[PDB]
Amino acid sequence: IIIATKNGKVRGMQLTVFGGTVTAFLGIPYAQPPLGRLRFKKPQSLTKWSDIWNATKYANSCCQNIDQSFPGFHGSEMWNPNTDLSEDCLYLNVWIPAPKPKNATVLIWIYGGGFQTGTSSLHVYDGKFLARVERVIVVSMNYRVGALGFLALPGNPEAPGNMGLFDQQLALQWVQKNIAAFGGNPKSVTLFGESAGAASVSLHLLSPGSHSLFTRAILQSGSFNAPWAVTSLYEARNRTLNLAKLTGCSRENETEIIKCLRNKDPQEILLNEAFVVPYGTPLSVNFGPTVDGDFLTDMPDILLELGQFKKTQILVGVNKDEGTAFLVYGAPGFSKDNNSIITRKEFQEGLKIFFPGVSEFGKESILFHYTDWVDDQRPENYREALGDVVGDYNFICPALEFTKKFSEWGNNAFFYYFEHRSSKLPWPEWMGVMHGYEIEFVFGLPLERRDQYTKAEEILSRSIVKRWANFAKYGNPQETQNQSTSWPVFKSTEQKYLTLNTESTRIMTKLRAQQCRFWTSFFPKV
Numbered sequence: 421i422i423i424a425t426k427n428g429k430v431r432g433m434q435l436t437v438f439g440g441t442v443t444a445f446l447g448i449p450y451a452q453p454p455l456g457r458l459r460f461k462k463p464q465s466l467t468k469w470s471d472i473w474n475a476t477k478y479a480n481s482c483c484q485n486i487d488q489s490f491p492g493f494h495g496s497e498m499w500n501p502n503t504d505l506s507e508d509c510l511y512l513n514v515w516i517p518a519p520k521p522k523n524a525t526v527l528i529w530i531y532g533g534g535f536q537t538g539t540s541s542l543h544v545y546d547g548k549f550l551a552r553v554e555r556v557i558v559v560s561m562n563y564r565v566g567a568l569g570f571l572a573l574p575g576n577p578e579a580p581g582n583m584g585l586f587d588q589q590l591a592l593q594w595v596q597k598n599i600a601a602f603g604g605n606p607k608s609v610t611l612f613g614e615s616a617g618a619a620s621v622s623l624h625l626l627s628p629g630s631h632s633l634f635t636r637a638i639l640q641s642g643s644f645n646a647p648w649a650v651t652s653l654y655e656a657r658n659r660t661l662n663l664a665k666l667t668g669c670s671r672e673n674e675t676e677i678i679k680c681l682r683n684k685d686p687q688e689i690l691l692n693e694a695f696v697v698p699y700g701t702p703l704s705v706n707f708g709p710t711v712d713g714d715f716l717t718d719m720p721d722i723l724l725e726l727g728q729f730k731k732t733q734i735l736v737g738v739n740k741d742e743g744t745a746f747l748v749y750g751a752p753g754f755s756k757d758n759n760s761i762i763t764r765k766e767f768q769e770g771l772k773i774f775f776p777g778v779s780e781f782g783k784e785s786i787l788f789h790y791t792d793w794v795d796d797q798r799p800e801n802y803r804e805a806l807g808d809v810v811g812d813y814n815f816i817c818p819a820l821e822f823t824k825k826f827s828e829w830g831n832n833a834f835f836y837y838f839e840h841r842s843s844k845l846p847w848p849e850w851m852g853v854m855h856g857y858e859i860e861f862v863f864g865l866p867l868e869r870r871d872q873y874t875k876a877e878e879i880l881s882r883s884i885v886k887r888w889a890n891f892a893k894y895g896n897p898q899e900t901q902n903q904s905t906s907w908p909v910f911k912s913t914e915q916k917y918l919t920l921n922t923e924s925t926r927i928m929t930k931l932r933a934q935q936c937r938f939w940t941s942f943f944p945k946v
């Protein structure tokens with residue numbers, strides 16, 4: 421089972437999935453390893469090889485700091501890298517149906533991780549379910565994260581910024597030139613991703629160098645206009661410089677800095693990423709997408725506002741409790757191991773943690789818009805309010821605003837609202853429908869009966885998988901057979917969206933409308 425690619429022959433392996441077979445090619449290199457003098461530079465193209473590359477195991481994950489706040493707890497550790505970390509991590513994976521499809525639609529996954537963490541090899545990113553059940557091809561790639569992938573000395577090719585995005589872009593290029601050999605249709609490629617993955621997919625909509633590398637886009641819990649998604653050219657420099665000092669690489673010649681940062685073990689670079697900013701938060705993106713003048717030619721809010729993106733269909737959506745995950749990473753009085761009833765004072769302190777550089781008036785204005793209580797006696801008023809504050813500001817309102825803005829230029833948009841809490845979810849109940857916990861459903865993990873998911877979850881994943889795959893194949897995320905609720909287009913007027921849950925799937929209008937008017941009109945002025 422050998423496929424000949426443009427750079428050489430690759431050998432895959434055979435997966436038994438649901439009384440059937442998927443061919444997995446795990447760990448195909450798609451760039452020269454960005455090592456030595458290649459560190460921080462854009463990804464260079466891969467020299468040809470004469471052997472049979474053995475793509476039979478996930479490859480090295482990119483260097484990254486590991487969440488060690490809940491050691492031994494699956495709800496945190498399920499997200500930590502499950503392969504050796506290395507700078508030599510520019511690899512991708514391909515699941516194709518067996519037998520080899522003819523002209524299959526291709527799904528390209530971009531993982532999240534706040535642009536600091538993440539890896540394609542995670543169990544909740546296993547594409548074999550989608551390959552088997554919908555006969556699409558799934559591709560996923562590793563891209564550089566943290567400083568190693570997003571250090572920015574603007575204009576300077578030694579550290580131009582946005583390398584991780586250019587890593588992704590080079591993977592998309594690989595699919596364009598090689599997926600035909602695997603039975604995929606290069607003309608039918610849907611980027612999908614979650615969180616920073618979703619912000620990445622949205623940036624590929626803007627980057628002209630990506631416009632011909634895919635067809636459609638799916639944005640799960642993320643978009644480039646999210647407040648955490650794009651570093652200012654200022655802060656990127658202040659960040660690059662503060663890193664140079666912490667490592668002792670402060671030089672007058674800016675390239676002499678990069679040279680100095682190139683003789684540091686990655687461990688030294690990662691240990692210093694944290695304090696590169698002055699006041700971090702649980703959502704800090706120390707090194708992330710920047711306006712490099714290359715991948716990104718202008719500030720994306722301007723590009724969005726003036727229709728300067730790929731015209732195509734988008735599938736956008738968010739989860740019901742996007743914000744609760746971050747509350748247990750610093751917020752006072754919070755814990756995954758109790759119900760986290762917090763007081764007014766505790767809520768106010770938590771705003772200082774999530775909005776450190778914000779004026780008191782700004783923080784009071786958040787308090788005022790979110791404490792008009794329907795019941796003052798309700799003891800978790802503040803706990804739920806602080807979670808909604810983080811979710812509405814960081815995910816739901818920018819994702820909604822992205823969808824209005826993008827659809828205003830005549831393209832079909834579909835907006836979902838995931839509100840099912842996984843029956844196997846290891847975080848406590850009050851954290852609800854958390855950030856990232858729609859992904860297993862998108863990937864069809866409840867489709868394996870051999871797990872402990874309920875029948876209702878199997879049906880929900882089954883429908884989501886159909887809707888996702890029909891969106892990839894046909895720009896339309898309906899399920900047309902099992903008498904399903906029709907998913908209407910999101911228009912700027914009606915703003916209709918589809919709820920996803922095991923109970924009843926409903927068409928609703930104008931998600932978080934009052935919340936988002938505050939976050940999208942008033943709060944940016946503070």
Ligand SMILES: *[C@@H]1O[C@H](CO[C@@H]2O[C@@H](C)[C@@H](O)[C@@H](O)[C@@H]2O)[C@@H](O[C@@H]2O[C@H](CO)[C@@H](O[C@@H]3O[C@H](CO)[C@@H](O)[C@H](O[C@H]4O[C@H](CO)[C@@H](O)[C@H](O)[C@@H]4O)[C@@H]3O)[C@H](O)[C@H]2NC(C)=O)[C@H](O)[C@H]1NC(C)=O
Pocket residue numbers: 431472474
């Ligand atoms: C990439 O993957 C291939 C295939 O691996 C196999 O794929 C599937 C088909 C499945 O069977 C898997 O279990 C398995 O991983 C690798 O192919 C193997 O290549 C090595 C050599 O590099 C072979 O080992 C040699 O086999 C000889 C059989 O004639 C044997 O004589 C060899 O003994 C040595 O010592 C004597 C003593 O003088 C010498 O005379 C010999 O010439 C030899 O050097 C040795 O056992 C395996 O048998 C191959 N696998 C199979 C299943 O046959 C390939 O190596 C791998 N490459 C990389 C870089 O990963």
Ligand SMILES: *[C@@H]1O[C@H](CO[C@@H]2O[C@@H](C)[C@@H](O)[C@@H](O)[C@@H]2O)[C@@H](O[C@@H]2O[C@H](CO)[C@@H](O)[C@H](O)[C@H]2NC(C)=O)[C@H](O)[C@H]1NC(C)=O
Pocket residue numbers: 658662663665666695696697698
């Ligand atoms: C731009 O960076 C300066 C300097 O960063 C400091 O030193 C680094 C090595 C690292 O340890 C950072 O965490 C430090 O912040 C920032 O200046 C500091 O600001 C804090 C309070 O904001 C102050 O108490 C320190 O004394 C300052 N240190 C110095 C050397 O000036 C500055 O705030 C950053 N600018 C922005 C807009 O964030």
Ligand SMILES: *[C@@H]1O[C@H](CO[C@@H]2O[C@@H](C)[C@@H](O)[C@@H](O)[C@@H]2O)[C@@H](O[C@@H]2O[C@H](CO)[C@@H](O)[C@H](O)[C@H]2NC(C)=O)[C@H](O)[C@H]1NC(C)=O
Pocket residue numbers: 751752753754755757758759760761
């Ligand atoms: C919920 O727990 C937090 C966290 O406290 C720690 O974790 C607990 C699960 C338990 O193992 C405790 O022994 C630990 O201290 C509590 O937050 C602390 O609250 C105390 C008293 O209010 C305060 O002195 C500490 O500063 C707090 N620490 C942190 C990190 O917030 C919280 O009180 C608990 N809430 C409820 C409703 O039980």
Ligand SMILES: CN(C[C@@H]1CCN(Cc2ccccc2)C1)S(=O)(=O)c1ccc2ccccc2c1
Pocket residue numbers: 487495496499533534535536537615616648702703704705745814854855856
């Ligand atoms: C420090 N990180 C967060 C921890 C790391 C591992 N835990 C995984 C988890 C995932 C879902 C629920 C519970 C736990 C979460 S991060 O990955 O570097 C990061 C940084 C900035 C971000 C800004 C916006 C959105 C996401 C961001 C992520």
Ligand SMILES: *[C@@H]1O[C@H](CO[C@@H]2O[C@@H](C)[C@@H](O)[C@@H](O)[C@@H]2O)[C@@H](O)[C@H](O)[C@H]1NC(C)=O
Pocket residue numbers: 879882883886899902
């Ligand atoms: C649709 O439903 C299948 C089984 O449910 C029953 O059978 C179908 C064919 C209907 O005629 C009706 O009797 C029931 O809904 C599932 O096996 C199948 O996976 C479902 N398809 C999707 C896309 O969810």
Ligand SMILES: CC(=O)N[C@H]1[C@H]([C@H](O)[C@H](O)CO)O[C@@](O)(C(=O)O)C[C@@H]1O
Pocket residue numbers: 756757846847848849
């Ligand atoms: C270690 C721990 O937390 N254990 C608790 C689990 C969940 O894991 C938490 O709610 C989220 O961590 O949930 C319980 O409510 C339960 O349903 O029996 C109590 C149990 O002791």
Ligand SMILES: *[C@@H]1O[C@H](CO)[C@@H](O)[C@H](O)[C@H]1NC(C)=O
Pocket residue numbers: 522523605607608
């Ligand atoms: C694949 O599909 C495209 C249209 O999407 C078509 O133009 C092309 O000829 C097809 N090629 C093969 C080999 O099926």
Ligand SMILES: *[C@@H]1O[C@H](CO)[C@@H](O)[C@H](O)[C@H]1NC(C)=O
Pocket residue numbers: 673674675676
């Ligand atoms: C910095 O050093 C590099 C080394 O090749 C050189 O090309 C560049 O001109 C230098 N810049 C300044 C401002 O001295």
Ligand SMILES: [Cl-]
Pocket residue numbers: 764796
């Ligand atoms: Cl009160």
Ligand SMILES: [Cl-]
Pocket residue numbers: 937938942
């Ligand atoms: Cl308002």
